Design a protein around this ligand. Structure first.
Ligand SMILES: [Cl-]
Ligand SMILES: [Cl-]
Ligand SMILES: [Fe+3]
Length: 335
């Protein structure tokens, strides 16, 4: 019940240097910045996007154990609740494994449980509402408005246990389920979403009966399950990719063949094929509308986590055509 209304809050990274995040998102993507003797932290984001980047200042800190194992990565996906203690006690009664019991600081009551791999979920309760946006330009074309979802690579044979956790413990709903096969490789994608609709996790499981792919590379190079990419809803995906490209952001490629045969599959209503081809944006549709997605290259030293831009017209979930296309694009840039 305290869990029923949970909303996506901040995404905490552990990083070796706060300036790697600054150079990446602030200087590259144009996000704003808003900055315990064991951790140095800064906040980066805009509108509804809120990242906390923390670099440990001592070896005896969880962030040092993280960066050693994974490098820079997502270590905690915080969930805003109206009551952090009540949400904690309910989730633990449901099976959740506690990481930190409820404690109050100044403007937050927090309680952390474990999530996929070694990534935490902190329940966070604010006294007067969530912090204000770091920067605001929601009405600007190409603006990055919110985090639409997260992609999570899981070890083979751990997908259904991950799904059961978020559904049984956290009450998420299953909104997508398909096994994707491309060439001699295959995967299983199951997307779970909070009843509030703001917390969406696409769970990806490699198919070990096939040949290995970039899913298998991530799991091996990251060091287990973790966030593969983070998707930013964009106030117009053609303009968001255009501006980012002018700032030095490199995106994954999609051959011209994709756009030559596109109108026999879908007729994009918002954009033209030349626009889509130029920016390398992928389009799909379902019963309610169309969906546009694109992946940015990973700038991570291990080539693991990367970023996605998405714009929804009527499409409220995920399409199998974009999922298949987005796999190929990621498979072409790394494995
Ligand atoms: Cl709250
Ligand atoms: Cl990256
Ligand atoms: Fe995605």
């Amino acid at each position: 019940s305290a869990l029923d209304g949970l909303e996506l809050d901040y995404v905490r990274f552990y990083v070796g240097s706060l300036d790697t995040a600054r150079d990446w998102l602030v200087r590259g993507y144009g996000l704003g910045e808003r900055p315990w003797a064991t951790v140095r932290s800064t906040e980066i984001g805009a509108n509804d996007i809120r990242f906390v980047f923390s670099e440990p200042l001592v070896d005896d800190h969880p962030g040092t154990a993280y960066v050693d194992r994974h490098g820079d990565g997502v270590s905690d996906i915080a969930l805003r609740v109206t009551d952090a203690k009540a949400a904690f006690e309910e989730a633990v009664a449901r099976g959740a494994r506690p990481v930190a019991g409820p404690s109050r600081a100044g403007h937050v009551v927090t309680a952390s449980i474990m999530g996929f791999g070694d990534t935490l979920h902190t329940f966070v309760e604010y006294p007067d509402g969530p912090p204000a946006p770091i920067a605001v330009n929601a009405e600007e074309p190409g603006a990055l408005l919110e985090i639409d979802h997260f992609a999570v690579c899981v070890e083979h044979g751990h997908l259904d246990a991950t799904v059961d956790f978020y559904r049984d413990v956290l009450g998420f709903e299953l909104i997508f389920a398909e096994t994707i096969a491309v060439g001699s490789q295959a995967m299983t994608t199951k997307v779970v979403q909070s009843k509030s609709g703001s917390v969406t996790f696409t769970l990806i499981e490699p198919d070990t009966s096939k040949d290995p792919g970039h899913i298998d590379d991530f799991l091996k190079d990251h060091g287990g399950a973790g966030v593969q990419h983070i998707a930013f809803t964009s106030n117009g995906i053609i303009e968001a990719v255009d501006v980012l490209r002018d700032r030095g952001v490199e995106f994954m490629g999609t051959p011209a063949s994709y756009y030559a045969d596109l109108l026999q599959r879908v007729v994009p209503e918002q954009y033209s094929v030349p626009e889509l081809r130029t920016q390398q944006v992928l389009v799909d549709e379902d019963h309610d509308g169309q969906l546009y997605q694109i992946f940015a290259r990973s700038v991570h030293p291990r080539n693991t986590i990367f970023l996605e831009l998405i714009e929804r017209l009527g499409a409220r979930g995920f399409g199998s055509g974009n999922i298949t296309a987005l796999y190929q694009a990621a498979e072409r840039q790394r494995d």
